[PDB]
């Protein structure tokens, strides 16, 4: 005997014990039986011969446990502004998870952003890789970082996009213990420590280093402008030095890491390129995940998915359009950077609508087995997962309803 | 030649033209066929013999179209500050549509409230009938309306219940053209217009009536205290007349409305009684819908309905819980007091999850026919429907999806 549905009305029932029992939907039915089976169509002219109990079933949802065989974790969380430079823009926060049409970041491009309105603190800069806070009050520092002359108009952000990208340390010059003083490797006369040196190292021209107490620092031009804005040390220009002296001087870096760039930055325009996008990716056979930024004016979602840009509801999370094929189930690391309340390597199932469900440790392999999902679901971070809806729990216990 | 689900995978197809088409859910399949039918179970070893198109189907939802044959229009939209009486609570707005457990309103019981918690304009009061705005800074007026001695610690309120009940006219003393002056019917000497008179109409003692330029008004003692604190006209007390005089002087019944009450008011305490409720009922064979106010501390919905209750959040309408059996579809008045956008007697289908699904007129009887729903669904007001929200639209036209 399998689990049953009526020849006419498809009413959901199974006998357990010695008695029939109605339930709500077939996913809960498979959950009850602990088997991935289908309710076969037999008329109630059987059913009436058998004694029947009372109404059961975990309410709400879902209906089909399909899944796509793509084991590579593509994740596109995204934000689309529109109508650039009034105060507030028209909005999508879109979301897809597959290969997609191209609108990536060119390495010169990076973009300023206002934080999602204060007291969520700060004003931020979307980098090559990361986000890092910048007080844009000092114009000389950030145009010395390479902005265009007053091309500044920040954009509001979705909080999910803002939590999607990991954050970098802030944008000032680092505080240096007794800069301007003498280092402990002691070059020729005019140099103070914490300053910049220049040296002819191209056959045409020069490249740029800095001074700590130990030795030299291979730095960008941008860091040099940063420190000369920080302290000129009473000195106009750095002096050029010999490469034989460069080999002859202590080559040792006290590591003041450059998250600061190498280049002047192309500024993105929200009229010219509204949609800014975070491409989280952990492929199969990867030990640690990667992240890129995408940016364009075309919606970079995959072709054919624009017909099925499906909207959710319920701001406080997602007010959001999404687009996929029929739904899936993914291996959530609720062990992560504060994923709501739950903390485990767990599994969360997700609909084509995009409502979340999931699995405990007390929820065994019988759960996913009756759902018939793959033994290996997909790794997924939390900040993309916070843009979904939250349904009821899943267990064989919670289906026992009145 | 019907709806077809696979004997193993239950994949959904109906052949049209000459070819097959994969679709999403069986409700959309019935929508395609235009007939309420069932997915027949045949193997793919037939399917392969027939050429196949691309994927179609309305995304999202629903499963099936049941309906409960109670044609009585019972509706409960409720407010429950669970975690009784702090400023911030767990917000249930309960939505049953049936009979329920006892939560009355005794006629002395009527409940003060702030607006949708301040800065929303004004303070309000829930009456026997309706809600009415009142500024409560005039303490003498409202305790002259009959408050207890400083029992005022009013309530916050969700906007859903505040838009559930219609508003009554305002709550001050009415502006009277030349009150205190001379009438046109001219009683014995001391009387100003806008004054009150008593008579021993209870065979013990008095009963209270106000005056216009034409004659008399049957007023409450509450209204008498209202006009008394409005203007005493330098007079301490009403005079006494007799029924001989009540008829003999012209009982020329002018009218200024007594929406104001008849009695002192039992002020309800939200710690004693948190849940306050609106019983919108249009019975079968009704010309106009009745409305009551309900009140208590017990969650007043039907017995057994709380184990199958469904929780609620997600502002943009309901942040509010719901409770029913499997779902229904109603003859909703979008002919009402600003029903959002639609203006028709329009059918909205609604799940046990509580997602609305509107039906147009160009969406003809074929739609409800293929859904198999009854030709007489239930008249529903807008303000309870606003405590649902929309998934996709429903037609065979928009079911042509990629």
CSV table of N, CA and C in Angstrom, one decimal, chain A residues 245-392:
chain,number,residue,atom,x,y,z
A,245,UNK,N,71.3,51.3,-4.4
A,245,UNK,CA,71.0,51.6,-3.0
A,245,UNK,C,69.7,50.9,-2.5
A,246,UNK,N,68.8,50.7,-3.4
A,246,UNK,CA,67.5,49.9,-3.1
A,246,UNK,C,67.8,48.5,-2.7
A,247,UNK,N,68.7,47.9,-3.4
A,247,UNK,CA,69.2,46.6,-3.0
A,247,UNK,C,70.1,46.7,-1.8
A,248,UNK,N,70.8,47.8,-1.7
A,248,UNK,CA,71.8,48.0,-0.6
A,248,UNK,C,71.0,48.4,0.7
A,249,UNK,N,69.9,49.0,0.6
A,249,UNK,CA,69.2,49.4,1.8
A,249,UNK,C,68.4,48.2,2.3
A,250,UNK,N,68.1,48.1,3.6
A,250,UNK,CA,67.2,47.0,4.1
A,250,UNK,C,65.8,46.9,3.4
A,251,UNK,N,65.6,45.9,2.7
A,251,UNK,CA,64.4,45.6,2.0
A,251,UNK,C,63.5,44.8,3.0
A,252,UNK,N,62.7,45.5,3.8
A,252,UNK,CA,61.9,44.8,4.8
A,252,UNK,C,60.6,45.6,5.0
A,253,UNK,N,59.5,45.0,4.9
A,253,UNK,CA,58.2,45.7,5.1
A,253,UNK,C,57.6,45.4,6.4
A,254,UNK,N,57.4,46.5,7.2
A,254,UNK,CA,56.5,46.4,8.3
A,254,UNK,C,55.1,46.5,7.6
A,255,UNK,N,54.4,45.4,7.6
A,255,UNK,CA,53.2,45.2,6.7
A,255,UNK,C,52.1,46.1,7.0
A,256,UNK,N,52.0,47.3,6.4
A,256,UNK,CA,50.8,48.1,6.4
A,256,UNK,C,50.1,47.9,5.1
A,257,UNK,N,49.1,47.0,5.2
A,257,UNK,CA,48.5,46.3,4.0
A,257,UNK,C,47.7,47.4,3.2
A,258,UNK,N,47.8,47.3,1.9
A,258,UNK,CA,47.1,48.1,0.9
A,258,UNK,C,45.8,47.4,0.5
A,259,UNK,N,44.7,47.7,1.3
A,259,UNK,CA,43.4,47.6,0.8
A,259,UNK,C,43.1,48.8,-0.1
A,260,UNK,N,43.8,49.9,0.2
A,260,UNK,CA,43.8,51.1,-0.7
A,260,UNK,C,44.3,50.7,-2.1
A,261,UNK,N,43.8,51.3,-3.2
A,261,UNK,CA,44.0,50.7,-4.5
A,261,UNK,C,45.4,51.1,-5.1
A,262,UNK,N,45.6,50.7,-6.3
A,262,UNK,CA,46.8,51.1,-7.0
A,262,UNK,C,46.6,52.2,-7.9
A,263,UNK,N,45.3,52.5,-8.2
A,263,UNK,CA,45.0,53.3,-9.4
A,263,UNK,C,44.0,54.4,-9.0
A,264,UNK,N,43.9,55.4,-9.9
A,264,UNK,CA,42.7,56.3,-9.9
A,264,UNK,C,41.5,55.5,-10.2
A,265,UNK,N,40.3,55.9,-9.7
A,265,UNK,CA,39.1,55.1,-9.7
A,265,UNK,C,38.1,55.8,-10.7
A,266,UNK,N,37.6,55.0,-11.6
A,266,UNK,CA,36.5,55.4,-12.5
A,266,UNK,C,35.3,55.3,-11.6
A,267,UNK,N,34.5,56.4,-11.6
A,267,UNK,CA,33.3,56.6,-10.8
A,267,UNK,C,32.1,56.1,-11.7
A,268,UNK,N,31.2,55.4,-11.1
A,268,UNK,CA,30.1,54.9,-11.7
A,268,UNK,C,28.9,55.9,-11.6
A,269,UNK,N,28.1,56.0,-12.6
A,269,UNK,CA,27.0,57.0,-12.6
A,269,UNK,C,25.7,56.2,-12.6
A,270,UNK,N,24.8,56.5,-11.7
A,270,UNK,CA,23.6,55.7,-11.5
A,270,UNK,C,22.6,55.9,-12.6
A,271,UNK,N,22.7,57.1,-13.4
A,271,UNK,CA,22.0,57.2,-14.6
A,271,UNK,C,22.6,56.3,-15.7
A,272,UNK,N,23.9,56.3,-15.8
A,272,UNK,CA,24.6,55.5,-16.8
A,272,UNK,C,24.6,54.1,-16.5
A,273,UNK,N,24.9,53.7,-15.2
A,273,UNK,CA,24.8,52.4,-14.8
A,273,UNK,C,24.1,52.3,-13.4
A,274,UNK,N,22.8,52.1,-13.4
A,274,UNK,CA,22.1,51.9,-12.2
A,274,UNK,C,22.4,50.7,-11.4
A,275,UNK,N,22.3,49.5,-12.0
A,275,UNK,CA,22.2,48.3,-11.2
A,275,UNK,C,23.6,47.9,-10.8
A,276,UNK,N,23.7,47.7,-9.4
A,276,UNK,CA,25.0,47.2,-8.8
A,276,UNK,C,24.7,45.9,-8.2
A,277,UNK,N,25.6,45.0,-8.2
A,277,UNK,CA,25.3,43.6,-8.0
A,277,UNK,C,26.4,42.9,-7.4
A,278,UNK,N,26.1,41.9,-6.5
A,278,UNK,CA,27.1,41.1,-5.8
A,278,UNK,C,27.0,39.7,-6.3
A,279,UNK,N,28.1,39.2,-6.8
A,279,UNK,CA,28.2,37.8,-7.3
A,279,UNK,C,29.0,37.0,-6.4
A,280,UNK,N,28.3,36.4,-5.4
A,280,UNK,CA,28.9,35.4,-4.5
A,280,UNK,C,29.0,34.1,-5.2
A,281,UNK,N,30.2,33.5,-5.1
A,281,UNK,CA,30.4,32.2,-5.8
A,281,UNK,C,31.2,31.3,-5.0
A,282,UNK,N,30.7,30.1,-4.7
A,282,UNK,CA,31.6,29.0,-4.3
A,282,UNK,C,31.3,27.8,-5.3
A,283,UNK,N,32.3,27.6,-6.2
A,283,UNK,CA,32.1,26.5,-7.1
A,283,UNK,C,32.3,25.2,-6.4
A,284,UNK,N,31.9,24.1,-7.1
A,284,UNK,CA,32.2,22.7,-6.7
A,284,UNK,C,33.8,22.6,-6.6
A,285,UNK,N,34.2,21.7,-5.7
A,285,UNK,CA,35.7,21.5,-5.5
A,285,UNK,C,36.4,22.8,-5.1
A,286,UNK,N,35.8,23.6,-4.3
A,286,UNK,CA,36.4,24.8,-3.8
A,286,UNK,C,36.5,24.7,-2.3
A,287,UNK,N,37.6,25.1,-1.7
A,287,UNK,CA,37.8,25.1,-0.2
A,287,UNK,C,37.3,26.4,0.4
A,288,UNK,N,37.5,27.5,-0.2
A,288,UNK,CA,36.9,28.8,0.3
A,288,UNK,C,36.3,29.6,-0.8
A,289,UNK,N,35.2,30.3,-0.6
A,289,UNK,CA,34.4,30.9,-1.6
A,289,UNK,C,35.0,32.2,-2.1
A,290,UNK,N,34.6,32.6,-3.3
A,290,UNK,CA,35.0,33.8,-3.9
A,290,UNK,C,33.8,34.8,-4.0
A,291,UNK,N,34.2,36.0,-4.3
A,291,UNK,CA,33.2,37.1,-4.5
A,291,UNK,C,33.6,38.1,-5.5
A,292,UNK,N,32.7,38.4,-6.4
A,292,UNK,CA,33.0,39.5,-7.3
A,292,UNK,C,31.9,40.5,-7.2
A,293,UNK,N,32.1,41.7,-7.8
A,293,UNK,CA,31.1,42.7,-7.9
A,293,UNK,C,30.8,42.9,-9.4
A,294,UNK,N,29.5,43.0,-9.7
A,294,UNK,CA,29.0,43.3,-11.1
A,294,UNK,C,28.3,44.6,-11.1
A,295,UNK,N,28.3,45.2,-12.3
A,295,UNK,CA,27.8,46.6,-12.4
A,295,UNK,C,27.4,46.9,-13.8
A,296,UNK,N,26.2,47.4,-14.0
A,296,UNK,CA,25.7,47.8,-15.3
A,296,UNK,C,24.5,48.6,-15.3
A,297,UNK,N,23.9,48.7,-16.5
A,297,UNK,CA,22.6,49.3,-16.7
A,297,UNK,C,21.6,48.3,-17.2
A,298,UNK,N,22.0,47.3,-18.0
A,298,UNK,CA,21.2,46.2,-18.3
A,298,UNK,C,21.0,45.3,-17.0
A,299,UNK,N,19.9,44.8,-16.8
A,299,UNK,CA,19.7,43.9,-15.7
A,299,UNK,C,20.5,42.6,-16.1
A,300,UNK,N,21.5,42.2,-15.3
A,300,UNK,CA,22.4,41.2,-15.7
A,300,UNK,C,21.9,39.8,-15.4
A,301,UNK,N,20.6,39.7,-15.1
A,301,UNK,CA,20.0,38.4,-14.9
A,301,UNK,C,19.9,37.6,-16.2
A,302,UNK,N,19.8,36.3,-16.1
A,302,UNK,CA,20.0,35.4,-17.3
A,302,UNK,C,18.8,35.6,-18.2
A,303,UNK,N,19.0,35.2,-19.5
A,303,UNK,CA,18.1,35.4,-20.5
A,303,UNK,C,17.0,34.4,-20.4
A,304,UNK,N,15.7,34.9,-20.5
A,304,UNK,CA,14.5,34.1,-20.3
A,304,UNK,C,14.1,34.2,-18.8
A,305,UNK,N,14.9,34.6,-17.9
A,305,UNK,CA,14.5,34.7,-16.5
A,305,UNK,C,13.8,36.0,-16.3
A,306,UNK,N,13.9,37.0,-17.2
A,306,UNK,CA,13.2,38.3,-17.1
A,306,UNK,C,11.7,38.1,-17.3
A,307,UNK,N,11.3,37.1,-18.0
A,307,UNK,CA,9.8,36.8,-18.1
A,307,UNK,C,9.3,36.3,-16.7
A,308,UNK,N,10.2,35.7,-15.9
A,308,UNK,CA,9.8,35.1,-14.7
A,308,UNK,C,10.4,35.8,-13.5
A,309,UNK,N,10.6,37.1,-13.6
A,309,UNK,CA,11.0,37.9,-12.5
A,309,UNK,C,9.8,37.9,-11.5
A,310,UNK,N,9.8,37.0,-10.5
A,310,UNK,CA,8.7,36.8,-9.6
A,310,UNK,C,9.0,37.6,-8.3
A,311,UNK,N,8.0,38.4,-7.9
A,311,UNK,CA,8.1,39.2,-6.8
A,311,UNK,C,7.6,38.5,-5.5
A,312,UNK,N,8.2,38.8,-4.4
A,312,UNK,CA,7.7,38.3,-3.1
A,312,UNK,C,6.8,39.3,-2.4
A,313,UNK,N,7.0,39.4,-1.1
A,313,UNK,CA,6.3,40.5,-0.4
A,313,UNK,C,7.0,40.5,1.0
A,314,UNK,N,6.5,41.4,1.9
A,314,UNK,CA,6.9,41.5,3.2
A,314,UNK,C,8.3,42.1,3.4
A,315,UNK,N,8.4,43.4,3.3
A,315,UNK,CA,9.6,44.1,3.7
A,315,UNK,C,9.9,43.9,5.1
A,316,UNK,N,11.2,44.1,5.5
A,316,UNK,CA,11.7,43.5,6.7
A,316,UNK,C,12.4,42.2,6.4
A,317,UNK,N,13.3,42.3,5.5
A,317,UNK,CA,13.8,41.2,4.7
A,317,UNK,C,13.8,41.5,3.2
A,318,UNK,N,12.9,40.8,2.5
A,318,UNK,CA,12.8,41.0,1.1
A,318,UNK,C,11.5,41.7,0.7
A,319,UNK,N,11.6,42.8,0.0
A,319,UNK,CA,10.5,43.4,-0.8
A,319,UNK,C,10.7,43.1,-2.3
A,320,UNK,N,11.0,41.9,-2.6
A,320,UNK,CA,12.0,41.7,-3.7
A,320,UNK,C,11.5,40.8,-4.8
A,321,UNK,N,11.8,41.2,-6.0
A,321,UNK,CA,11.7,40.3,-7.2
A,321,UNK,C,12.8,39.2,-7.2
A,322,UNK,N,12.4,38.0,-7.5
A,322,UNK,CA,13.4,36.9,-7.7
A,322,UNK,C,13.1,36.2,-9.0
A,323,UNK,N,14.0,35.4,-9.5
A,323,UNK,CA,13.8,34.7,-10.7
A,323,UNK,C,14.6,33.4,-10.7
A,324,UNK,N,14.0,32.2,-10.9
A,324,UNK,CA,14.6,31.0,-11.0
A,324,UNK,C,13.7,30.0,-11.8
A,325,UNK,N,14.2,28.8,-12.0
A,325,UNK,CA,13.4,27.6,-12.3
A,325,UNK,C,12.7,27.2,-11.1
A,326,UNK,N,11.8,26.2,-11.2
A,326,UNK,CA,11.2,25.5,-10.0
A,326,UNK,C,12.2,25.1,-9.0
A,327,UNK,N,11.8,25.1,-7.7
A,327,UNK,CA,12.6,25.3,-6.6
A,327,UNK,C,13.6,24.2,-6.2
A,328,UNK,N,14.3,24.4,-5.1
A,328,UNK,CA,15.5,23.7,-4.8
A,328,UNK,C,15.8,23.6,-3.3
A,329,UNK,N,16.9,23.0,-2.9
A,329,UNK,CA,17.2,22.9,-1.5
A,329,UNK,C,18.7,22.9,-1.3
A,330,UNK,N,19.2,23.8,-0.4
A,330,UNK,CA,20.6,24.2,-0.3
A,330,UNK,C,21.1,23.9,1.1
A,331,UNK,N,22.5,23.7,1.1
A,331,UNK,CA,23.2,23.4,2.3
A,331,UNK,C,23.6,24.7,3.0
A,332,UNK,N,22.8,25.1,3.9
A,332,UNK,CA,23.1,26.4,4.6
A,332,UNK,C,24.1,26.2,5.6
A,333,UNK,N,25.1,27.1,5.7
A,333,UNK,CA,25.9,27.3,6.8
A,333,UNK,C,25.3,28.3,7.7
A,334,UNK,N,24.4,27.9,8.6
A,334,UNK,CA,23.9,28.7,9.7
A,334,UNK,C,25.0,28.9,10.7
A,335,UNK,N,26.1,28.1,10.7
A,335,UNK,CA,27.4,28.5,11.3
A,335,UNK,C,28.0,29.5,10.3
A,336,UNK,N,27.9,30.8,10.7
A,336,UNK,CA,28.4,31.9,9.9
A,336,UNK,C,28.4,33.2,10.6
A,337,UNK,N,28.4,34.3,9.8
A,337,UNK,CA,28.5,35.6,10.3
A,337,UNK,C,27.1,36.1,10.8
A,338,UNK,N,26.7,35.7,12.0
A,338,UNK,CA,25.4,35.8,12.6
A,338,UNK,C,24.3,35.5,11.6
A,339,UNK,N,24.0,34.2,11.3
A,339,UNK,CA,22.8,33.9,10.5
A,339,UNK,C,21.6,33.8,11.4
A,340,UNK,N,20.8,34.9,11.4
A,340,UNK,CA,19.7,35.1,12.2
A,340,UNK,C,19.9,34.6,13.6
A,341,UNK,N,19.0,33.8,14.1
A,341,UNK,CA,19.2,32.9,15.3
A,341,UNK,C,20.0,31.6,15.0
A,342,UNK,N,19.6,30.7,13.9
A,342,UNK,CA,20.2,29.4,13.9
A,342,UNK,C,21.6,29.3,13.6
A,343,UNK,N,22.3,28.3,14.2
A,343,UNK,CA,23.8,28.1,14.1
A,343,UNK,C,24.1,26.6,13.9
A,344,UNK,N,24.2,26.2,12.6
A,344,UNK,CA,24.6,24.8,12.3
A,344,UNK,C,25.0,24.7,10.9
A,345,UNK,N,25.7,23.7,10.5
A,345,UNK,CA,25.6,23.2,9.1
A,345,UNK,C,24.2,22.6,9.0
A,346,UNK,N,23.3,23.2,8.3
A,346,UNK,CA,21.9,22.7,8.2
A,346,UNK,C,21.6,22.7,6.7
A,347,UNK,N,20.3,22.3,6.4
A,347,UNK,CA,19.8,22.4,5.1
A,347,UNK,C,18.6,23.3,5.1
A,348,UNK,N,18.5,24.2,4.2
A,348,UNK,CA,17.3,25.0,4.0
A,348,UNK,C,16.8,24.8,2.6
A,349,UNK,N,15.5,24.4,2.5
A,349,UNK,CA,14.8,24.3,1.2
A,349,UNK,C,14.2,25.6,0.9
A,350,UNK,N,14.1,25.9,-0.4
A,350,UNK,CA,13.7,27.1,-0.9
A,350,UNK,C,12.8,26.9,-2.2
A,351,UNK,N,11.7,27.7,-2.3
A,351,UNK,CA,10.8,27.5,-3.3
A,351,UNK,C,11.2,28.4,-4.5
A,352,UNK,N,10.5,28.2,-5.6
A,352,UNK,CA,10.5,29.1,-6.7
A,352,UNK,C,9.9,30.5,-6.3
A,353,UNK,N,8.9,30.4,-5.4
A,353,UNK,CA,8.5,31.6,-4.8
A,353,UNK,C,9.6,32.2,-3.9
A,354,UNK,N,10.3,31.4,-3.2
A,354,UNK,CA,11.4,31.8,-2.4
A,354,UNK,C,11.1,31.9,-0.9
A,355,UNK,N,10.4,30.9,-0.4
A,355,UNK,CA,10.1,30.8,1.0
A,355,UNK,C,11.0,29.8,1.6
A,356,UNK,N,11.6,30.1,2.8
A,356,UNK,CA,12.6,29.2,3.4
A,356,UNK,C,11.9,28.1,4.3
A,357,UNK,N,12.6,27.0,4.3
A,357,UNK,CA,12.3,25.8,5.2
A,357,UNK,C,13.6,25.2,5.5
A,358,UNK,N,13.6,24.2,6.4
A,358,UNK,CA,14.9,23.6,6.8
A,358,UNK,C,14.9,22.4,7.8
A,359,UNK,N,16.1,22.0,8.1
A,359,UNK,CA,16.3,20.7,8.6
A,359,UNK,C,17.3,20.8,9.8
A,360,UNK,N,16.9,20.1,10.9
A,360,UNK,CA,17.7,20.0,12.2
A,360,UNK,C,18.6,18.9,12.1
A,361,UNK,N,19.3,18.6,13.3
A,361,UNK,CA,20.0,17.3,13.4
A,361,UNK,C,19.1,16.2,13.9
A,362,UNK,N,18.1,16.5,14.7
A,362,UNK,CA,17.1,15.6,15.1
A,362,UNK,C,16.2,15.3,13.9
A,363,UNK,N,16.1,16.2,12.9
A,363,UNK,CA,15.6,15.8,11.6
A,363,UNK,C,16.6,15.1,10.8
A,364,UNK,N,16.4,13.8,10.6
A,364,UNK,CA,17.4,12.9,10.1
A,364,UNK,C,17.4,12.8,8.6
A,365,UNK,N,18.1,11.8,8.0
A,365,UNK,CA,18.1,11.7,6.6
A,365,UNK,C,16.8,11.2,6.0
A,366,UNK,N,15.9,10.7,6.9
A,366,UNK,CA,14.5,10.3,6.5
A,366,UNK,C,13.8,11.6,5.9
A,367,UNK,N,14.1,12.7,6.5
A,367,UNK,CA,13.4,14.0,6.1
A,367,UNK,C,13.7,14.3,4.6
A,368,UNK,N,15.0,14.5,4.3
A,368,UNK,CA,15.5,14.8,3.0
A,368,UNK,C,15.2,13.6,2.0
A,369,UNK,N,15.2,12.4,2.6
A,369,UNK,CA,15.0,11.2,1.8
A,369,UNK,C,13.5,11.1,1.3
A,370,UNK,N,12.6,11.4,2.2
A,370,UNK,CA,11.2,11.5,1.8
A,370,UNK,C,11.0,12.7,0.9
A,371,UNK,N,11.8,13.7,1.1
A,371,UNK,CA,11.8,14.8,0.1
A,371,UNK,C,12.5,14.4,-1.1
A,372,UNK,N,13.4,13.4,-1.0
A,372,UNK,CA,14.1,12.9,-2.2
A,372,UNK,C,15.2,13.8,-2.7
A,373,UNK,N,15.7,14.7,-1.9
A,373,UNK,CA,16.7,15.6,-2.4
A,373,UNK,C,18.1,14.9,-2.5
A,374,UNK,N,19.0,15.6,-3.1
A,374,UNK,CA,20.4,15.1,-3.2
A,374,UNK,C,21.0,15.1,-1.8
A,375,UNK,N,21.9,14.1,-1.6
A,375,UNK,CA,22.7,14.0,-0.4
A,375,UNK,C,23.6,15.2,-0.2
A,376,UNK,N,24.0,15.9,-1.3
A,376,UNK,CA,24.9,17.1,-1.3
A,376,UNK,C,24.1,18.3,-1.7
A,377,UNK,N,23.5,19.1,-0.9
A,377,UNK,CA,22.9,20.4,-1.3
A,377,UNK,C,24.0,21.5,-1.3
A,378,UNK,N,23.5,22.7,-1.6
A,378,UNK,CA,24.6,23.6,-2.0
A,378,UNK,C,24.9,24.6,-0.9
A,379,UNK,N,26.2,24.8,-0.7
A,379,UNK,CA,26.7,25.8,0.2
A,379,UNK,C,26.2,27.2,-0.2
A,380,UNK,N,25.7,27.9,0.8
A,380,UNK,CA,25.0,29.2,0.6
A,380,UNK,C,25.2,30.1,1.8
A,381,UNK,N,25.7,31.3,1.7
A,381,UNK,CA,25.8,32.2,2.8
A,381,UNK,C,24.5,32.8,3.3
A,382,UNK,N,24.5,33.5,4.4
A,382,UNK,CA,23.3,33.9,5.0
A,382,UNK,C,22.7,35.2,4.4
A,383,UNK,N,23.6,36.1,4.0
A,383,UNK,CA,23.1,37.4,3.6
A,383,UNK,C,22.3,37.4,2.3
A,384,UNK,N,22.6,36.4,1.5
A,384,UNK,CA,21.7,36.2,0.4
A,384,UNK,C,20.4,35.5,0.9
A,385,UNK,N,20.5,34.7,1.9
A,385,UNK,CA,19.4,33.9,2.4
A,385,UNK,C,18.4,34.7,3.1
A,386,UNK,N,18.8,35.9,3.6
A,386,UNK,CA,17.9,36.8,4.4
A,386,UNK,C,16.9,37.5,3.4
A,387,UNK,N,17.1,37.3,2.1
A,387,UNK,CA,16.2,37.9,1.2
A,387,UNK,C,15.1,36.9,0.7
A,388,UNK,N,14.7,36.0,1.6
A,388,UNK,CA,13.7,35.1,1.3
A,388,UNK,C,12.5,35.2,2.3
A,389,UNK,N,11.5,34.4,2.0
A,389,UNK,CA,10.4,34.4,3.0
A,389,UNK,C,10.6,33.3,3.9
A,390,UNK,N,9.9,33.3,5.1
A,390,UNK,CA,10.1,32.3,6.1
A,390,UNK,C,8.7,31.6,6.3
A,391,UNK,N,8.7,30.3,6.1
A,391,UNK,CA,7.5,29.6,6.3
A,391,UNK,C,7.5,28.9,7.6
A,392,UNK,N,6.6,27.9,7.8
A,392,UNK,CA,6.6,27.1,9.0
A,392,UNK,C,7.8,26.2,9.1
